[PDB]
Amino acid sequence: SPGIWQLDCTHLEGKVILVAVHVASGYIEAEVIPAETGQETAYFLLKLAGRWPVKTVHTDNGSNFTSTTVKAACWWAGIKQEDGIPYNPQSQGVIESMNKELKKIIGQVRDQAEHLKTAVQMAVFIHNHKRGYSAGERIVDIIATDIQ
Amino acid sequence: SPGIWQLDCTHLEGKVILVAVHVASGYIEAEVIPAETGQETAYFLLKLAGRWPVKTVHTDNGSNFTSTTVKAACWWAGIKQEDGIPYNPQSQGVIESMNKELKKIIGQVRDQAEHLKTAVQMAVFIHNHKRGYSAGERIVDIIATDIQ
Numbered sequence: 001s002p003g004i005w006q007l008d009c010t011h012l013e014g015k016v017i018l019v020a021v022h023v024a025s026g027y028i029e030a031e032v033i034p035a036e037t038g039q040e041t042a043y044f045l046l047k048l049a050g051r052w053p054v055k056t057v058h059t060d061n062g063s064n065f066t067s068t069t070v071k072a073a074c075w076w077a078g079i080k081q082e083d084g085i086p087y088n089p090q091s092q093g094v095i096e097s098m099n100k101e102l103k104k105i106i107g108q109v110r111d112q113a114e115h116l117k118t119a120v121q122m123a124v125f126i127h128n129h130k131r132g133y134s135a136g137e138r139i140v141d142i143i144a145t146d147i148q
Numbered sequence: 149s150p151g152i153w154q155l156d157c158t159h160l161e162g163k164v165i166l167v168a169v170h171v172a173s174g175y176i177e178a179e180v181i182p183a184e185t186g187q188e189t190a191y192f193l194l195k196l197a198g199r200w201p202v203k204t205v206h207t208d209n210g211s212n213f214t215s216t217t218v219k220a221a222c223w224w225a226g227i228k229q230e231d232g233i234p235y236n237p238q239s240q241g242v243i244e245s246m247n248k249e250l251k252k253i254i255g256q257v258r259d260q261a262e263h264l265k266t267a268v269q270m271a272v273f274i275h276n277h278k279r280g281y282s283a284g285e286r287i288v289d290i291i292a293t294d295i296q
């Protein structure tokens with residue numbers, strides 16, 4: 001459980017927002033990309049795995065599950081690539097609610113940033129710091145408990 | 149101490165590698181940028197602070213210390229912007245040695261990646277996972293101890 005992440009891809013202003021959620025904590029990392037390609041997803045995963053101990057990734061769709069570049073990145077980084085099928089149906093709703101929450105924050109900061117990518121990073125900040133512990137506090141505690 | 153980061157800017161293949169080091173652990177985050185501008189540094193700091201609890205940043209040079217965009221990002225993210233003057237002279241050497249180590253890793257992976265930005269992220273991964281604890285383990289423990 002401390003090593004499990006879920007990929008999530010949402011759309012805003014004609015651009016794509018790629019999100020990784022740490023399932024146990026609700027902590028996120030996100031980036032704006034022109035389009036969701038295997039290459040972009042692969043690069044995003046390399047970044048993520050160098051920063052947190054990523055053991056398993058539930059991919060966001062079949063295309064990224066199939067992509068040879070995504071598979072190469074998962075091999076390189078020692079990540080077990082799994083499907084993101086919501087065998088527990090509440091998983092879909094939780095992800096959907098997070099996407100709505102994130103878009104709401106983006107709208108609230110949108111004026112403070114010229115570029116969407118900046119607004120997204122502000123939204124990541126606000127999400128991870130929101131309290132009662134924050135997602136940022138929870139991910140650290142979960143992982144620290146695991147090491148020890 | 150758990151909230152203190154140091155910025156570091158090094159050069160390779162005619163491009164700029166911007167690095168943030170968590171001083172107490174040796175954990176790093178890095179990005180390739182065309183050139184070190186206030187705007188790029190500001191954006192990098194927004195990303196960093198959404199992901200880890202950044203309380204203080206020792207800026208890498210006077211230009212970034214002075215930059216109004218960097219100051220705006222530090223204000224936004226609740227970061228205390230400080231100088232990076234090595235009042236303890238061993239600080240310069242430690243940073244220099246890390247830059248050499250990182251360039252060495254980049255050279256060792258350079259063949260596995262078409263693009264420098266990819267090689268840099270692979271180097272971040274290898275640095276943070278290198279064991280006796282790893283930098284990734286140390287940053288988590290330090291921060292977890294602080295919350296508790």
Ligand SMILES: CC(C)C[C@H](CNC(=O)c1cccnc1)Cc1ccc2c(c1C(=O)O)OCO2
Nearest residue numbers: 111112113114115118187188190191220221224
């Ligand atoms: C820290 C925040 C409060 C301001 C900072 C500077 N922007 C403005 O002053 C501004 C505000 C409103 C309208 N137009 C500009 C945001 C920022 C930082 C770095 C970047 C950016 C941006 C961006 O504006 O997207 O783009 C890529 O590198």
Ligand SMILES: CC(C)C[C@H](CNC(=O)c1cccnc1)Cc1ccc2c(c1C(=O)O)OCO2
Nearest residue numbers: 039040042043072073076259260261262263266
């Ligand atoms: C996971 C590694 C092992 C391979 C992966 C794909 N590259 C190759 O197969 C390859 C290797 C050597 C020469 N030409 C191609 C690397 C990668 C992933 C995502 C990206 C990339 C790159 C990149 O190659 O820089 O560029 C931005 O998005």
Ligand SMILES: [Cl-]
Nearest residue numbers: 051052053284
């Ligand atoms: Cl790690």
Ligand SMILES: [Cl-]
Nearest residue numbers: 136199200201
């Ligand atoms: Cl945080």
